[PDB]
Ligand binder design. Structure first.
Ligand SMILES: COc1cc(OC)c(-n2c(=O)cc(C(F)(F)F)[nH]c2=O)cc1Cl
Ligand SMILES: COc1cc(OC)c(-n2c(=O)cc(C(F)(F)F)[nH]c2=O)cc1Cl
Ligand SMILES: *Cc1c(COP(=O)(O)O)cnc(C)c1O
Ligand SMILES: *Cc1c(COP(=O)(O)O)cnc(C)c1O
Lengths: 365, 365
């Protein structure tokens, strides 16, 4: 055991710098900054000194376990250029907690979370001009941890690479205003199972998801509604946690989300939304199981107000439509404002871009 | 939608050749040959011309979907230097069928199966001296298909690499004659689920498996017994299909294996063993569900003869012991010969090394 340390950072500035993109015409994860973080690991010598250096291709042995046995995990967090032109990270300690936990579950070697965060701060600081000059755009931070074991043996890797990429991203839909998603619901496909890795951000979870995603796009849907179990539990909306704002069976007004029972990725946005709803104390907040039957029963009873997905990329993604067993189930999210969705988006946006102070934000070192 | 063609092969021989290893001191997937196959793909231009060239590191964009979203699959088949010094592939068309099917499920681009097989034949032919001069050793062939999409966008990859590695491998256990495995049975972990990709050889299935494998090694076990469902179905023995030779509940002598209901990798060895057992017609052959309760009930009734795993790496791996609910359940496989296990290994070995003729073997082009 041990860790790489930020104070040992070897910075190799780029001699040639790239023109930044137009913040208004940005496709997600397409454009990359001048520099990246890389840290080598071996079982023999442990963590090498971390490097900030020019963005380059990785030279990987073709037997690298990341390519064969998906010995890999990632994270998604953002840096935001605020209204006061100060750059802020948003709850980055929750990403470090989740990446550590993912590393343990992948059997990739542990590291000091404070040392990674500080290494990421230095990377964003070097490339701080890539944090878009726009109140509707952000720098996407992609920490990645891959096994580079050069053997086809299925085992704990004896070699690993931890690297970070920065990618400037614009608003979720390039129109800026709310574009509601249609969800493809086919229970033939299952994202995660009890005793699986669904509650970790491990690459394996996404490779298996990709067929259903393409099947969704074919039928005019943007995301997959992930169903689980005999009773068709609604779990996640694609790459996002699932929120339902409704009148519940007891007749109380309720914000409901599936509980962290192993098949749900504990999202940062999900945490923040639950924290806000609790704090406001205006309606019942329930981590509880939701079925398609629960949802359709409520729809014919006009009890559904809003449904939305939460995640680092979209923050709040309203749901208008679900395609399930060949019928098109409409969700009246956009006909109800969407009131709660708009309030959450505005609250999180205000915090991220420094319009109000919060413990959730850290100004860049 | 098209394909690369064997007749377009661009061969770049190596100017410096490596010394072959001692077949008696070979760890699995550790040592690699002089050359590899590489074929580039793009959505724009389609399949580039295939290349046989010196074994080298892959230069990959750090955003490659194989590293982030485990957009990857592999295969495992062998070349065998026979008793007549002719090199044979073993049912390689089943590997091509299974790799194609896996490519469709991963949303990686399709290819002509005959053209891949012929490209692999040419690769093995160039490196044919790496096929060990040993009747107990083989050349492991690792076709690999990875998404090289340089964007963090979760979608069908617009760029891919299909590459093949050759690795000389020794006998299954390095002490030659049968060394039985002890299995770690902990139902907390689940390899595959209904609606998953367990019946495909996609990297994601193995990344998730790795924690249970390390937990097994900790408790002196070599493989994991993968349990599924309320009733604890025995599904696979680690990276191998599960065979049970026993007296069944009706008192008939039976060779039983879990059925291809979505959570079982349809193994080539599994297919061949079922085909042989059917052909012999000496006992009942049942693709049917096996539970830990079924197994323990049969053990206390002295109805269990042999249990073994099947797969390209081991062929037949006898099981002596299962660690389950803290106790050590002994399996009398080694006290019963193992009769059937030894007969299967000898039949498959005879076919692979050309001691008897079979439709299952192809002599190298
Ligand atoms: C040292 O004991 C072993 C343990 C193994 O897994 C735990 C394997 N093994 C396979 O059986 C199959 C594959 C795969 F997936 F490539 F087919 N890869 C492997 O490492 C081989 C040996 Cl010799
Ligand atoms: C509107 O089109 C999109 C569709 C998406 O999922 C298909 C995503 N998307 C990612 O691509 C990656 C992640 C992550 F980071 F979790 F992997 N989360 C996301 O929502 C982003 C956009 Cl902009
Ligand atoms: C990343 C992710 C989320 C949302 O996590 P955030 O930290 O809010 O971005 C939800 N579901 C899955 C499957 C995810 O991978
Ligand atoms: C590869 C594999 C097998 C065996 O397949 P073969 O073609 O016989 O090598 C069995 N189970 C799993 C999970 C596998 O990945």
């Amino acid at each position: 055991v041990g860790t790489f340390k930020a104070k040992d950072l070897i910075v190799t500035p780029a001699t040639i710098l790239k023109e930044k993109p137009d913040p208004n015409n940005l496709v997600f994860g397409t454009v990359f900054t001048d520099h990246m973080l890389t840290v080598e690991w071996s079982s023999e010598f442990g963590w090498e000194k971390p490097h900030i250096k020019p963005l380059q291709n990785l030279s990987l042995h073709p037997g690298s376990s990341a390519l064969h046995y998906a010995v890999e995990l990632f994270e998604g967090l953002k840096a935001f250029r605020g209204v006061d032109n100060k750059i802020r990270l948003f709850q980055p300690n929750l990403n470090m907690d989740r990446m550590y936990r993912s590393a343990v579950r992948a059997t990739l070697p542990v590291f000091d979370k404070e040392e990674l965060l500080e290494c990421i701060q230095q990377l964003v600081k070097l490339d701080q001009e890539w944090v878009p000059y726009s109140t509707s755009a952000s720098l996407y931070i992609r920490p990645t941890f891959i096994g580079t074991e050069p053997s086809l043996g299925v085992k704990k890797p004896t070699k690993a690479l931890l690297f970070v990429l920065l990618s400037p991203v614009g608003p979720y839909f390039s129109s800026g205003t709310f574009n509601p998603v249609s969800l493809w619901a086919n229970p033939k496909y299952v994202r995660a199972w009890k005793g699986g890795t669904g509650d970790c951000k491990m690459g394996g979870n996404y490779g298996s998801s990709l067929f259903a995603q393409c099947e969704a796009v074919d039928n005019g849907c943007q995301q997959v509604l992930w169903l689980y179990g005999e009773d068709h539990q609604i779990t996640e909306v694609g790459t996002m946690n699932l929120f339902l704002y409704w009148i519940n069976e007891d007749g109380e007004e309720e914000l409901a989300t599936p509980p962290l029972d192993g098949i749900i990725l504990p999202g940062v946005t999900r945490r923040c939304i639950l924290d806000l709803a609790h704090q406001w104390g205006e309606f019942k907040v329930s981590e509880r199981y939701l079925t398609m039957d629960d949802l359709t029963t409520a729809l014919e009873g006009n009890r559904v107000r809003e449904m939305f997905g939460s995640g680092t990329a979209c923050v709040v993604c309203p749901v208008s439509d679900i395609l399930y067993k060949g019928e098109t189930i409409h969700i009246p999210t956009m006909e109800n404002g969407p009131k709660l969705a708009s309030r959450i988006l505005s609250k999180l946006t205000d915090i991220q871009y420094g319009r109000e102070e919060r413990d959730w934000t850290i100004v860049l070192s």
